[PDB]
Amino acid sequence: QFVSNVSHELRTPLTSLRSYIEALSDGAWKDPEVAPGFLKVTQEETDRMIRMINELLSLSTRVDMELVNINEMFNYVLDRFDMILKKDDNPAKYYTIKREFTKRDLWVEIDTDKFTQVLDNIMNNAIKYSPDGGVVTCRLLETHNQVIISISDQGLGIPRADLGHVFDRFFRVDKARQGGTGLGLAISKEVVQMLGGRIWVDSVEGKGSTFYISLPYE
Amino acid sequence: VTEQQKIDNDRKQFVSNVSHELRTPLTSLRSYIEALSDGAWKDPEVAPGFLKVTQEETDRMIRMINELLSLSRMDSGTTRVDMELVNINEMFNYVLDRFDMILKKDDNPAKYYTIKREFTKRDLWVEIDTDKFTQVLDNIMNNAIKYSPDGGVVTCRLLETHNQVIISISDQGLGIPRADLGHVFDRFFRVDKQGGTGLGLAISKEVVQMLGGRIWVDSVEGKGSTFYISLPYE
Numbered sequence: 001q002f003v004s005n006v007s008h009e010l011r012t013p014l015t016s017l018r019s020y021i022e023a024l025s026d027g028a029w030k031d032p033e034v035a036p037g038f039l040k041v042t043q044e045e046t047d048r049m050i051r052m053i054n055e056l057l058s059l060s061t062r063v064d065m066e067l068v069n070i071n072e073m074f075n076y077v078l079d080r081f082d083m084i085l086k087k088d089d090n091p092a093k094y095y096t097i098k099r100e101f102t103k104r105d106l107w108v109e110i111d112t113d114k115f116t117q118v119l120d121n122i123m124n125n126a127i128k129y130s131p132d133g134g135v136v137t138c139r140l141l142e143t144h145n146q147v148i149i150s151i152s153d154q155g156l157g158i159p160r161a162d163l164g165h166v167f168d169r170f171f172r173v174d175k176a177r178q179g180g181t182g183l184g185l186a187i188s189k190e191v192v193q194m195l196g197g198r199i200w201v202d203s204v205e206g207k208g209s210t211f212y213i214s215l216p217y218e
Numbered sequence: 219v220t221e222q223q224k225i226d227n228d229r230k231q232f233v234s235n236v237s238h239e240l241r242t243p244l245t246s247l248r249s250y251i252e253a254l255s256d257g258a259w260k261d262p263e264v265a266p267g268f269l270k271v272t273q274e275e276t277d278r279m280i281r282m283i284n285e286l287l288s289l290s291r292m293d294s295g296t297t298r299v300d301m302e303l304v305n306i307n308e309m310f311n312y313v314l315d316r317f318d319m320i321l322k323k324d325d326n327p328a329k330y331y332t333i334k335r336e337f338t339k340r341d342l343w344v345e346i347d348t349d350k351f352t353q354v355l356d357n358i359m360n361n362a363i364k365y366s367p368d369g370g371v372v373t374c375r376l377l378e379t380h381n382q383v384i385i386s387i388s389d390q391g392l393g394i395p396r397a398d399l400g401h402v403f404d405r406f407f408r409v410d411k412q413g414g415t416g417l418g419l420a421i422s423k424e425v426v427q428m429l430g431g432r433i434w435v436d437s438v439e440g441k442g443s444t445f446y447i448s449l450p451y452e
């Protein structure tokens with residue numbers, strides 16, 4: 001349903017917007033080296049949220065495939081999550097984003113808005129389900145004519161019995177450790193399949209998780 | 219026929235409203251961010267003032283999102299309701315204690331108010347979900363204070379009948395038009411035209427209904443209002 005999806009999907013961009021506005025208010029507005037770049041991101045997130053409301057309201061049409069540089073696009077996503085982490089209430093370096101991208105530029109046909117939603121949910125999960133903190137490792141590679149993204153955490157894991165169930169709508173693992181609706185990964189799977197790709201997960205209950213996304217390369 | 223239709227119409231309206239209400243702050247943000255990007259950011263007389271407004275608009279949307287999410291969770295049957303036997307007197311008194319304590323600090327207070335308590339003497343043990351019900355009392359108490367005249371008295375009652383536990387919360391503010399006594403519990407209904415979503419009482423009505431109870435309001439314009447909560451007793 002519309003309300004539930006739009007509400008769920010606005011949360012990461014609102015957090016990201018809040019985070020950059022906070023950095024600006026805290027003094028970055030005085031720094032000519034960074035203020036314009038920060039303002040540019042808030043302008044982009046605000047416009048993205050406005051498109052998102054409309055898109056999701058209309059579905060109750062466009063899957064807009066563009067040839068995109070995944071390297072840059074993934075990098076832009078992770079830049080926001082670093083900003084969320086720095087303006088976080090946690091101690092500095094309580095969470096780390098380590099990037100492991102191949103050096104060649106990878107061009108892939110995607111819907112930029114919808115796929116950002118996918119990366120947002122997985123990064124946000126990777127953080128939300130590491131309460132004790134940790135490194136989030138983000139990999140970008142091409143092999144066997146697939147472009148593959150994997151996102152690993154050192155968080156709470158996922159029971160083996162539930163590895164399949166986690167992409168189902170409303171499914172939330174019911175053990176100790178919060179969350180919300182159980183929609184993020186179902187929305188994500190829907191987008192990834194729509195784009196001709198695949199998503200899957202490996203996990204160890206005490207160690208952490210790795211989510212994988214595969215997209216057709218050429 | 220009409221039954222399914224009324225439902226579908228309410229849903230269609232609610233969706234339309236959600237889209238308009240999320241859109242309006244974002245549109246306001248866009249306008250302040252664009253002024254900032256066009257150069258106001260270099261200007262110390264306005265950049266801080268402008269940033270502050272974007273921060274407030276952003277907070278309002280995050281509250282709206284959280285509120286819309288609870289409404290969804292309940293609409294889904296997904297919402298966890300944990301009925302436990304608790305002392306309503308001590309729970310209500312603690313709620314009022316948080317509000318008295320707010321006033322105890324010189325802000326300066328914008329407005330002074332008094333919280334008058336009239337509780338029954340016997341202890342009322344009743345099964346409820348404390349986390350959710352405290353939220354309900356908060357929403358009514360915040361309204362009661364917000365719409366009180368300077369120096370107004372907020373009167374809080376806990377009384378039981380043979381069949382019911384009744385809580386009432388009265389203010390001496392401008393009250394509510396008779397045409398609207400029902401509508402104030404509607405999603406996004408605000409009689410007025412700053413922050414405030416118009417979802418609080420909609421959440422409250424839904425929560426009180428999950429708990430097996432009833433909530434309603436009496437008001438005489440210019441007199442003030444009295445909100446009631448009824449809970450099944452024993």
Ligand SMILES: Nc1ncnc2c1ncn2[C@@H]1O[C@H](COP(=O)(O)OP(N)(=O)O)[C@@H](O)[C@H]1O
Pocket residue numbers: 121125126127129130153155156157158166171172173174179180181182183184185186208209
């Ligand atoms: N990175 C992760 N580590 C451990 N558990 C995770 C995880 N990412 C997702 N999960 C689990 O999968 C369930 C469903 O995820 P999701 O669709 O994104 O739900 P959500 N967080 O939007 O409420 C979550 O409730 C959580 O139990």
Ligand SMILES: Nc1ncnc2c1ncn2[C@@H]1O[C@H](COP(=O)(O)OP(N)(=O)O)[C@@H](O)[C@H]1O
Pocket residue numbers: 357361362365389391392393394402407408409410413414415416417418419420443
């Ligand atoms: N105690 C009260 N006195 C006068 N009007 C009241 C009132 N409590 C609620 N109302 C009216 O009902 C409307 C909706 O209440 P509510 O759902 O709590 O709004 P809110 N606080 O989330 O923005 C308010 O805007 C107000 O017009």
